[PDB]
Each structure stands twice: as C-alpha cells, then as structure tokens.
Ligand binder design. Sequence first.
Ligand SMILES: *[C@@H]1O[C@H](CO)[C@@H](O[C@@H]2O[C@H](CO)[C@@H](O)[C@H](O)[C@H]2NC(C)=O)[C@H](O)[C@H]1NC(C)=O
Ligand SMILES: *[C@@H]1O[C@H](CO)[C@@H](O[C@@H]2O[C@H](CO)[C@@H](O)[C@H](O)[C@H]2NC(C)=O)[C@H](O)[C@H]1NC(C)=O
Ligand SMILES: *[C@@H]1O[C@H](CO)[C@@H](O[C@@H]2O[C@H](CO)[C@@H](O)[C@H](O)[C@H]2NC(C)=O)[C@H](O)[C@H]1NC(C)=O
Ligand SMILES: *[C@@H]1O[C@H](CO)[C@@H](O[C@@H]2O[C@H](CO)[C@@H](O)[C@H](O)[C@H]2NC(C)=O)[C@H](O)[C@H]1NC(C)=O
Ligand SMILES: *[C@@H]1O[C@H](CO)[C@@H](O[C@@H]2O[C@H](CO)[C@@H](O)[C@H](O)[C@H]2NC(C)=O)[C@H](O)[C@H]1NC(C)=O
Ligand SMILES: *[C@@H]1O[C@H](CO)[C@@H](O[C@@H]2O[C@H](CO)[C@@H](O)[C@H](O)[C@H]2NC(C)=O)[C@H](O)[C@H]1NC(C)=O
Ligand SMILES: *[C@@H]1O[C@H](CO)[C@@H](O[C@@H]2O[C@H](CO)[C@@H](O)[C@H](O)[C@H]2NC(C)=O)[C@H](O)[C@H]1NC(C)=O
Ligand SMILES: OC[C@H]1O[C@H](O[C@H]2O[C@H](CO)[C@@H](O)[C@H](O)[C@H]2O)[C@H](O)[C@@H](O)[C@@H]1O
Ligand SMILES: OC[C@H]1O[C@H](O[C@H]2O[C@H](CO)[C@@H](O)[C@H](O)[C@H]2O)[C@H](O)[C@@H](O)[C@@H]1O
Ligand SMILES: OC[C@H]1O[C@H](O[C@H]2O[C@H](CO)[C@@H](O)[C@H](O)[C@H]2O)[C@H](O)[C@@H](O)[C@@H]1O
Ligand SMILES: C[As](C)(=O)[O-]
Ligand SMILES: [Ca+2]
Ligand SMILES: [Ca+2]
Ligand SMILES: [Ca+2]
Ligand SMILES: [Ca+2]
Ligand code: NA
Lengths: 157, 161, 218, 223
Amino acid sequence: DLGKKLLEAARAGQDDEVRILMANGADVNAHDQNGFTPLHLAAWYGHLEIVGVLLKNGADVNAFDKYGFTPLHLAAEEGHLEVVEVLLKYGADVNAKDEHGSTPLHLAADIGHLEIVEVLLKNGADVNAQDKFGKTAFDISIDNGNEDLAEILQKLN
Amino acid sequence: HHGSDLGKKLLEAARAGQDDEVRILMANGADVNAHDQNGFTPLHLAAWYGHLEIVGVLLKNGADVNAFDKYGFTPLHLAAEEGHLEVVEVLLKYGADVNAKDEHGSTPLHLAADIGHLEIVEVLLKNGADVNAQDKFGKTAFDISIDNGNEDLAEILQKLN
Amino acid sequence: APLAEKPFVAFGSGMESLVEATVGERVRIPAKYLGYPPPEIKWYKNGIPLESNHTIKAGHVLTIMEVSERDTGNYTVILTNPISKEKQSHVVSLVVYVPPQIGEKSLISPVDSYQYGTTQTLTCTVYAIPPPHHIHWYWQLEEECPCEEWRSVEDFQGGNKIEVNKNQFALIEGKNKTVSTLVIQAANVSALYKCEAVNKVGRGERVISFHVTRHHHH
Amino acid sequence: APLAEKPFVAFGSGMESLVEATVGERVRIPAKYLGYPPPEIKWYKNGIPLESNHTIKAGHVLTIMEVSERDTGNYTVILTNPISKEKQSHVVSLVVYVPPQIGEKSLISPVDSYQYGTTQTLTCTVYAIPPPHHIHWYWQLEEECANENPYPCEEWRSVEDFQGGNKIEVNKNQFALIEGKNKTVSTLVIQAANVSALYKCEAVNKVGRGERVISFHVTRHHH
Ligand SMILES: *[C@@H]1O[C@H](CO)[C@@H](O[C@@H]2O[C@H](CO)[C@@H](O)[C@H](O)[C@H]2NC(C)=O)[C@H](O)[C@H]1NC(C)=O
Ligand SMILES: *[C@@H]1O[C@H](CO)[C@@H](O[C@@H]2O[C@H](CO)[C@@H](O)[C@H](O)[C@H]2NC(C)=O)[C@H](O)[C@H]1NC(C)=O
Ligand SMILES: *[C@@H]1O[C@H](CO)[C@@H](O[C@@H]2O[C@H](CO)[C@@H](O)[C@H](O)[C@H]2NC(C)=O)[C@H](O)[C@H]1NC(C)=O
Ligand SMILES: *[C@@H]1O[C@H](CO)[C@@H](O[C@@H]2O[C@H](CO)[C@@H](O)[C@H](O)[C@H]2NC(C)=O)[C@H](O)[C@H]1NC(C)=O
Ligand SMILES: *[C@@H]1O[C@H](CO)[C@@H](O[C@@H]2O[C@H](CO)[C@@H](O)[C@H](O)[C@H]2NC(C)=O)[C@H](O)[C@H]1NC(C)=O
Ligand SMILES: *[C@@H]1O[C@H](CO)[C@@H](O[C@@H]2O[C@H](CO)[C@@H](O)[C@H](O)[C@H]2NC(C)=O)[C@H](O)[C@H]1NC(C)=O
Ligand SMILES: *[C@@H]1O[C@H](CO)[C@@H](O[C@@H]2O[C@H](CO)[C@@H](O)[C@H](O)[C@H]2NC(C)=O)[C@H](O)[C@H]1NC(C)=O
Ligand SMILES: OC[C@H]1O[C@H](O[C@H]2O[C@H](CO)[C@@H](O)[C@H](O)[C@H]2O)[C@H](O)[C@@H](O)[C@@H]1O
Ligand SMILES: OC[C@H]1O[C@H](O[C@H]2O[C@H](CO)[C@@H](O)[C@H](O)[C@H]2O)[C@H](O)[C@@H](O)[C@@H]1O
Ligand SMILES: OC[C@H]1O[C@H](O[C@H]2O[C@H](CO)[C@@H](O)[C@H](O)[C@H]2O)[C@H](O)[C@@H](O)[C@@H]1O
Ligand SMILES: C[As](C)(=O)[O-]
Ligand SMILES: [Ca+2]
Ligand SMILES: [Ca+2]
Ligand SMILES: [Ca+2]
Ligand SMILES: [Ca+2]
Ligand code: NA
C-alpha cells in the first residue's frame, strides 16, 4: 500500500522519496494502527522539509493519534523548534489535549525543552491548563526541580 | 415549521427596542440566537442599545450570554462600552464572563476605562474583572486611564484582592 | 457609586484625531471623556447630526459596521455635561483605504486577435487609495497550463519582446487612476498577460488574452 | 500662574519620561510640581502602589537606593492638590542596564592543568543588558603572566594572532535560557594542548565590560 510507504518515508526522513509517492497519489492523511499520520511521523523525527511538503498538500495539522498526540505534541516533546514553528504557522492547536490532558506545553516542560516552552507561551499556550492529574506546567517544573523552567513560567503564572 | 426570515426581523426588532415586535417574533418561533454578518446576536444589539427589558426577555429564553461577534465583542463588551449600567448588571447576573477578550485582547474593563465610565468600572471590578489583564498592546486598564489623564479612574483600578 | 465632584466635561488625553480603515472593515471611533456626570454624546458629519441605524451607531463609540469609501471625512463629536450644559468638541479625521481595482474598460477590446509581427499595447488602469506603489506584469502561454505558474515579462524566451512603460496618472472616472501600459514590440506568440497592482492595503489583478494571427488581407 | 488664581497642581516643565540606570547605582526620579498648597504624592509601579521601606523611598523624589534589574518598569506618579483634590499624573519609564556578567568563575587559585595533546573547549556564558555588542577571546603564553584577579598578564594577544600558541578555533555563539534570560554562550576550542597559556574572553556592552581569565597549563603525564 502506498499509504504505508508514505508513513515510513516520512518517518525515515526520505525527503526526495516522499515526493515520488506524492506524485503517485499517496494519501497525505494515511494513518497506521497508532493513529500516526505522515505529518505525525515527520514532525516527531524533526524532518523540517517533509513537514513543509505535507502541510502544503493538505496534511491535517491537528490529527490526533490513538492516544491523543497531535504532531505539535510530538514535535514539542522531542525538541524540534523549527518544526514546532511551522506547525503553529499552519494552524496547530497550541492547547490540544491528549488522553492524559497534556498540552504540548506540558510535554515540553516535563522533558525540559526551555526554548520550546518559550515559543509555545508566546503563541498562546495556556500556562494554567491542568492535565488529568491536576498538574500545570509550573507544577511540573517544581516536581522536576527545574529552576530555569520555573523562572520562564513564573512571570506569566 | 420554521421561519428563517424571523431571525433577521428579531435582530432589528431588538436593535430598535421594539418590545412588542420582539414578543411577537418570539411567539412565532424566532431564534433568540440568530446572528447577522457582523456576528451580532439579538442580545448583542439589545444590550448595545441598552434595551433593558428586551435584554431580560432574550436572556430568559436562552440567548447565549457569552456569544462573541466577528470582532470578539460579547454583549457585556458592548453594554459596558456604552455605559448601560443596568444592562451590565443583568448580563453579569445571567453569567456573562467579565474577563472575555475581544480580538485585540480588550476586556470590558479595558473598554469602559478607555471611554471613561467610572460606575461601569466599579461594577465590573466588584464582579471579578482582572485589573492586571493586558490587551495586545500590553496596556492594563490602569495604563489606559493614565493615558487619558484620568487619575480618579486610575485610583479605582486597584485589585480588590 | 463614584463620589460626586464638581461638574466638568473634557476629552481624555487619549482621544484620537486620525483614524485609518480599509473598505469593508468595522470602524470604531470612541469619544473618550473625563467628567461628572457622564456626558451626553452627539456625532456630526458635514454639520449634520448622525442617527443610528443598522449600518452605523452614533453613541459613545462611533461604530461603522462596514466602512465604505464615502465614509471618509471629518467627524465632530460634542460632549455635553448634563448638569452644567458645558460643551466640548473634537474632530476626528477618518481615512478609508481602497485596495486596487483594475478598470474593466480600456482592458476589453473589439479585437479577437492581433496581426503577427505588429506592435500592440495592453493597458491596466488602477484605482487605489493610496495609489498603488507597484504594478507588475506577468505572462504565460495557454498551453503551459487561472494558472499556477507565471513568468515575469522580463523573460522573452517563449514569449514576446516586451517593455513596460512607466506609470502615468490620469483622471478618468472623476478619480485619479494610475495607468500601466505593456508594449508588445512584435506580436509573434499568443499568450496570457497578467497585471497585478499592489498598494498599502491590498492587491488586485487582471488577466488579458493576447491572440496572434497571421490571417490578413495583404 | 493661571489667570484664575486658585489652589492648583501641575508638573514642572522639566519632567523626564525615560530614565536609564545601571545595576547598583542610586536612582532618583523627582516629581517636580507647581502650585499651592504643596501636593500629595503617590507612586505606582506598573499600576501597583509603592510604599517606602529601607530599599526605596516614594516621596517627592522616588529614590531606589541600589537599583536592580527587576526595578525596570513604568512608574506613575499622581499629584493631588490637598484643597481642591484636582490631580495630575506622569509616567516615567525606568530602564536598568547590566554590564556583561560571565557565569564561569575567573578564579585561577587552583590552576587547571591539561594533558599534552588533549582537545578542550573553554566557555563563557555571558549576560548583559543591552546584549553585548561583541565577545572577543584573547590569549598569552604562560611565561609572560603571573600565577598566584591578579591581572595576570600585562599584554594580551588576539586569538587571530595565534602564532606560537595552541591551535584554536572560536565557535559561533550559542544561546541558553538561564534564570529566565537569553544568555550568550561563547566557546573556544583548543585542538591539541601543546603550549601552556592563559585565555581570556571579554564582553563589552553599552554600560561596561566583563572578562574571565582561564588558565591552560599543559603537562605530559606518562605511563
Ligand atoms: C512601559 O511602557 C512602554 C511604553 O508604553 C512599554 O513598551 C511597549 O510595549 C509594547 C508591548 O508590551 C510594545 O509593543 C511596544 O513597542 C513598546 N513600546 C516602547 C516605546 O517600548 C513597556 O512594555 C511598558 N512596561 C511594562 C512592564 O509594561
Ligand atoms: C444609516 O444612516 C446613515 C446616516 O447616519 C445613512 O447614510 C446616508 O445615505 C444617503 C444616501 O442615500 C446620503 O445621501 C446621506 O448623506 C448619508 N448620511 C450621512 C453620510 O450622514 C444611511 O442611508 C442609513 N441607512 C439606513 C437608514 O438603512
Ligand atoms: C478636515 O478638517 C481638516 C482641518 O481640521 C482639513 O485639513 C486642513 O486642510 C487645509 C487645506 O488643505 C489646510 O490648510 C489645513 O492645515 C488642514 N488642517 C490640518 C492639517 O490640521 C481637512 O481638509 C478636512 N477634510 C474634510 C474631508 O473635511
Ligand atoms: C494623480 O496622482 C498623483 C498623486 O499621487 C499626482 O502626482 C504628483 O504630481 C505632482 C505635480 O503634478 C508632483 O509634484 C508629485 O511628485 C506627483 N506625485 C508622484 C508620486 O509622482 C498627480 O498630480 C495626481 N493628479 C490628479 C489630477 O489628481
Ligand atoms: C520594599 O518595597 C518594595 C516596593 O514597595 C518591594 O518590592 C517588591 O518586590 C517583590 C519581589 O517579588 C515584588 O513582587 C513586588 O511587586 C514589589 N513591590 C511592588 C509595590 O511592586 C520590596 O520587596 C520591599 N522590601 C522589603 C524588605 O520590605
Ligand atoms: C604546538 O602545535 C601547533 C599546532 O600544530 C604548532 O604550530 C604550528 O607550527 C608550525 C611550525 O612551527 C607551523 O608550520 C604551523 O602553521 C603551526 N600551526 C598553527 C595552527 O599555527 C606549534 O609549533 C606547536 N608548538 C610546540 C612548542 O610544539
Ligand atoms: C537569544 O538572542 C539571539 C540573538 O539575538 C537570538 O537569535 C536571533 O534571532 C533572530 C530572530 O529569531 C534572528 O533573526 C537572528 O538571526 C538570530 N541571531 C543569531 C545570532 O542567531 C535568539 O533567538 C534568542 N533566543 C531566545 C531564546 O530568546
Ligand atoms: O531524528 C533523530 C534526530 O533528532 C534531531 O535531529 C532532527 O531534528 C533537527 C532539528 O531539531 C533537524 O535539523 C534534523 O533534520 C532532524 O533529524 C537531533 O538533533 C539528532 O541528534 C537526532 O539523531
Ligand atoms: O522544442 C524544444 C525547445 O523548447 C523551448 O524553446 C522554444 O520552444 C518554442 C517552440 O517553438 C519556441 O517558440 C520558444 O520561443 C522557445 O523557448 C526550450 O526552452 C528549448 O530549450 C527547447 O529545446
Ligand atoms: O540631571 C540633573 C540631576 O543630576 C543628578 O541626578 C543624576 O545622578 C544621580 C546620582 O548618581 C542619580 O541618582 C539620578 O538618577 C541621576 O538623574 C542630581 O542628583 C539631581 O539633583 C539633578 O537634578
Ligand atoms: C612553549 As611554553 C613556550 O609556554 O613552555
Ligand atoms: Ca422600547
Ligand atoms: Ca454573575
Ligand atoms: Ca490631567
Ligand atoms: Ca477629580
Ligand atoms: Na505592559
């Protein structure tokens, strides 16, 4: 199946190869059993070019996988700054919630990607949003002993 | 069964303060939550023009008190900006969000402060207005009142916490 | 309620004096006031008092739901203190910008095709407020495609040799229009041409068909 | 005075609207007034009223005894005539500058020794307000300096003038969000340590300079 090939090409960062599948009618919003779309996979692995190609060809920027992760969730969690910016440019929901209630800001805070946290905040991330454990990003910074993160969030708290 | 034209009539009846016309349109099934190309609902217009009784009638029949138009204005925004005190109180009584933001980040408190409605500011404040809220230029209501040379208002614009 | 002080009326220091809008937008001109009790507000344009209707509301904030070019002008707001009857006036200038519009006349011809090898001109007449700061021409062959790719007229390879005359200005509809003329030096290839006009507030374009024919009675 | 002569309050003509200071100095912002009787004064920072304590006095002159970076902000003063209660207000923007601060300590008290041939990276994490307009690295042979801030070297060499020293490269600047601030991370790479040296990074901005001296002593441990 062409959709399966496109998923793996996007995951594997085969910049030139996805374009061949694209001209051959591959479904940009193909999904697998995880609910991953090619855009999920390109953003998760930080393939900036492929993310751009998919977005221009109608890839759904706000698709949820089986656990509620959107591509912006994955790009945030893995620290792909430029990918995060391009997803936001194409209308990603900065406050998308996964099955746990986690926003991209939650995921980036928990890992510790300070710059990603800063970009989310200036693009409207909700500093007060609680996940289903009642945790905010500030709570996470305290739980992790992350003073540098706390100092970024504390101002807007 | 349904009259699609009725919603358009209800908007203008509410805007023009035509109480008996509003009463007839609603009895004939007019949709209290109709909207026009501005995004105005009947509650927007009745509140914007301070038509207190019509505001009550629409609220009592399920008008969405927090509806926002094409520019982010809620009925509370419009009533506060226009100084319609009694309307502001009934909107707040029916659960209006005192800190709703329009597309430029202004809250009703920002709008009332910029015009200069001191009593409206007092009512908003006693109903939970966030004095610290900034619009998209970074202005608080305090800042706005000082820009206007309105020191009496600035002294009002202080947290009740 | 606020403590009652001696009656007074004035405009707030932040009262606007110039307002800019684009055709089609909602315009808001607030009358920012100081004083006690709250003043009565009245708006005037051309000395005539404004009344509120579904297109325009003349209250504490002058709101025009969908501004048009004809709404351009000086608006006067008068504050009246309800106790002292003292009055204050303030004039707001409203400027309404118009994205470019390309004249349908002087673009449409009585000619289906132009004779091979002749000089021909296409003209693009633009009205915009402010006047367009650039007018660009593009072209494409019909066969190479309402097209996704356009070429700049500087590129002559598959097309015609072309020169763009400098912008001129003409009063045509009682209004000052900018006129851009494209000179086809020798009509040798059929093509589509696009003039696109850009100004502070938007862009506009028009596509012209240019059919070349060797039929003639020579 | 106004034609109608009655109690009034107004500001003096010379009121500043921007004030610049450097971390550590005393800041004085006068509320110059005209009128009678002398007005009542109240100061606000970003709309919050200031009370006087040992750190700051909010009288006719707003005085911050030792200004800090967190003192940046918009200060509003409101004058009130005590008879008429007429009011006037004025906003002063206070900007607090920071000469370049380097996070790594400049302490050579224990001297850093490196094994012959190793590759090492020296780093300077620089914060300044405004940001530094340049960050430069310098070096010197250990013999021409003291070990014992003892101003260790009387002359410094530019790392462009590298002849006779270690192979070195200055990497492009990187940036890190530290303590909530965008700090510049400047790195120098010593390719193969074969010459004992001191290294210095220097940062300059509008209000000052900061530097850090790094010892780079080389020894060949054997077996
Ligand atoms: C103090 O006042 C200045 C001037 O109003 C503020 O600076 C403006 O900030 C907005 C957004 O916050 C910017 O869009 C403007 O470009 C700034 N203007 C100038 C002249 O700098 C400043 O933010 C205020 N300080 C605080 C803490 O709010
Ligand atoms: C809404 O009110 C405005 C005026 O407040 C009306 O605008 C007038 O339109 C006529 C054209 O038929 C002009 O000749 C007048 O000069 C306009 N008045 C101005 C410019 O003040 C408008 O027609 C009204 N719309 C309604 C009643 O539906
Ligand atoms: C609106 O009023 C202003 C004046 O308030 C007019 O602008 C003046 O135009 C004359 C002649 O062009 C100049 O001599 C003045 O200096 C202008 N006033 C200024 C610059 O403050 C303006 O033409 C009026 N426009 C309309 C549509 O009535
Ligand atoms: C129509 O267009 C422009 C207004 O933008 C006018 O061009 C100006 O003409 C005067 C003298 O004729 C020159 O001094 C200016 O330098 C010209 N401006 C530019 C941008 O070239 C033109 O006169 C207008 N004509 C009418 C009748 O309105
Ligand atoms: C002395 O007073 C100043 C200002 O009146 C205090 O500054 C406050 O500092 C805290 C630090 O987190 C801020 O949150 C407050 O907003 C500041 N106050 C104002 C009014 O803005 C300072 O803390 C006081 N120091 C002592 C020892 O009492
Ligand atoms: C330490 O190593 C450096 C780097 O190899 C030596 O510098 C080189 O010296 C030779 C001749 O002396 C030159 O041809 C090279 O161009 C130099 N390289 C650079 C990068 O400048 C240096 O001589 C060595 N010093 C000692 C004492 O062994
Ligand atoms: C920290 O400061 C640096 C230097 O200003 C920032 O890097 C610049 O970012 C702008 C806008 O994104 C670019 O146009 C410049 O090309 C960048 N300059 C350099 C030298 O990289 C950096 O983005 C800032 N980082 C944070 C987290 O605020
Ligand atoms: O996919 C694993 C790699 O992730 C990072 O690199 C990706 O993200 C970069 C931007 O964050 C892109 O420039 C690059 O194309 C991506 O592959 C990480 O930097 C690598 O070390 C990982 O191997
Ligand atoms: O036929 C192949 C060539 O096509 C292009 O060049 C010309 O094509 C048209 C065919 O008549 C000409 O009218 C036109 O003016 C030319 O651009 C292409 O650019 C050439 O490199 C090809 O060899
Ligand atoms: O510029 C006239 C004023 O000069 C002095 O004030 C400056 O120097 C002070 C001491 O370093 C600072 O605390 C203050 O913020 C500066 O503006 C002087 O103290 C004033 O009396 C003069 O008016
Ligand atoms: C090479 As040495 C010159 O610092 O022993
Ligand atoms: Ca009525
Ligand atoms: Ca309520
Ligand atoms: Ca004043
Ligand atoms: Ca007063
Ligand atoms: Na601000």
